[model samples]
Target: TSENRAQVAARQHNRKIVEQYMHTRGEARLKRHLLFTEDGVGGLWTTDSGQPIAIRGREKLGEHAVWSLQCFPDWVWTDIQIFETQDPNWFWVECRGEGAIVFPGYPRGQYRNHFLHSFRFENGLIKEQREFMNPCEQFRSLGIEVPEVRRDGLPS
Candidate 1:
């Protein structure tokens, strides 16, 4: 009973933190949800092709928010599923949405996307994050070229 209660509490805390971050916009609000290691290490990944989405530091992650806004300036989550893992500090989430892209040369149509994210928290801050999404078909459907990566020795 006690263990279950603790797990529930941990999940509740994580949900609160994540919901706050999702509700807010901009880089400063996003960083408040993250925790960087001594080496300023954090990771983002795509499962479709097993690519490590490179991010240099907190600022780089912040810049990514800007880039994302450029594409889907008014995007909002249409559906969300949140889960708490056996590890108290870990959370898994799935979010789905549709938004219009403002990027040049792309068809002016709202594209739907789904993302699965895993977050590891330390002291209530997200220490690491991994995301999975397959936007290749989405881009192709909009008549946009999906960048291809030809690399080896990806991190497991």
Candidate 2:
């Protein structure tokens, strides 16, 4: 029970941090840059609360990565509607907003959604992170072009 409680606490703390960061940055400025380290291999990962699941569908490509480029440029995170924490330092918080970025690229549109994040911290600073965009249709509707995987280690 203690371990579970600790995890829940950590998750809550993380969720708060994420919400605060998003609030300060004005969603449009909140872009995620994922880092892949060597000597690492593993299965799918999820938050202690399990909102956004990080699944590395492939290996040999560094630690698989994902990120939310930005919230719908117009959203002003007024308040957090839901929050949850999980074990081993994982958490998620959802803030009710007027609009959200459903996809990437030009001519963006607004849709009702929450900003989701999965985080890990070290010495109080976030060391590793992954983000997921919701309402999957947003990606297709906006005609967002998926970045091509580099095969020769150079932009193709």
CA RMSD of all predictions: 7.3, 13.0
Q: Residue by residue across 22-63, what tens digits does model 1's lDDT show?
A: 455444544542444322334457634567866656666665
Top candidate (TM-score): 1
The worst-scoring run of ten residues by lDDT in candidate 2 lies at 32-41
Q: Which stretches of candidate 2 lie over 4 Å from their true place?
A: 1-16, 27-72, 78-88, 96-108, 140-156
Cα lDDT tens digits for candidate 2, 1-156:
997786666666666555554464343333322222232222223333446454432233222222333434555554554344434444454554455564444566665544555555543334445544444434434555545566897666
The lDDT per prediction is 0.65, 0.45
The whole-model C-alpha lDDT of candidate 1 against the native structure comes to: 0.65
Model 2 pairs whose backbones collide = 7-86, 7-87, 48-86, 72-101
